[PDB]
């Protein structure tokens, strides 16, 4: 039987911590700030994913192009194989052709 | 396992309650119970 016999410890969420309270601030940096900055510049994350969106294959090509040279050998090999597989899947397989 | 069923017990019990009065493993084993319950209904 995969059900717990006690209630889980209750979840306390501070709805008014600094992160939640100041969420969304500067989203309109461009339209209210003479277009000196794009909102996309506020995005914090991987180099290859900053203010860009794409499917799994597109993301992998982008990663290889941008940070490929700095990658670990095993990680690079995996990315190469991933691209190779995704290529075959997206081009050669599916319902609609 | 980002999402997994936490309510499976109750899903099983919905079928099993109708199987209680059957004889044999039909009354308790879901795989067998479900088939007999569909027939019963």
């Amino acid at each position: 039987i995969g059900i717990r016999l006690t209630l889980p410890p209750p979840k306390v969420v501070d709805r008014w911590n600094e992160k939640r309270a100041m969420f969304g601030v500067y989203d309109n940096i461009g339209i209210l700030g003479n277009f000196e900055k794009h909102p996309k510049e506020l995005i914090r994350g991987p180099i290859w994913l900053r203010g860009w969106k794409g499917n799994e294959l597109q993301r992998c090509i982008r990663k290889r192009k941008m940070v490929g040279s700095r990658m670990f050998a095993d990680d690079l090999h995996n990315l190469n194989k991933r691209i190779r597989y995704l290529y075959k899947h997206f081009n050669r397989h599916g319902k609609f052709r | 396992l980002r999402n997994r069923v936490t309510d499976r017990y109750f899903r099983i019990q919905e079928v099993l309650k109708h199987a209680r009065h059957f004889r044999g493993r039909k009354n308790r084993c879901y795989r067998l119970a479900v088939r007999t319950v569909i027939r019963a209904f």
Binding site: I3, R4, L5, T6, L7, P8 | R4, T6, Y9, F10
Partner: peptide, 26 residues
Amino acid sequence: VKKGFRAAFRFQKELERQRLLRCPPP
């Protein structure tokens, strides 16, 4: 251990009913 509250709560309620049925209060 599965994350969630609702299922555990429901099961507590079931066990409560079982306890009541097994040992009825005066």
